[PDB]
Amino acid sequence: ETLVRPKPLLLKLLKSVGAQKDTYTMKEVLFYLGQYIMTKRLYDEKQQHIVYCSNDLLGDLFGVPSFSVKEHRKIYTMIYRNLVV
């Protein structure tokens, strides 16, 4: 059901917090990614849709110091740039 292939920085990200494989569903990459953040306490404690990726792997792949979960389209766009679909 089209499985996707993370590119090397996102696969590294995914592996770091458990993941075992090279190919995934979108669901799966989204659960592992959400896991990575919450796990890396990259989220802002008072307005927790904000995420910081300065001096982190996450900014290496997204190219920005921070971002807002609300920005659904912008965030999907960045994830896809990191997948062969």
């Binding site: 989204l30 849709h49 979960v69 609300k70």
Partner: peptide, 12 residues
């Protein structure tokens, strides 16, 4: 609103 839910809004 939790990060959890905002991200659960992002998927869904």
């Amino acid at each position: 609103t939790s990060f959890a839910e905002y991200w659960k809004l992002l998927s869904c």
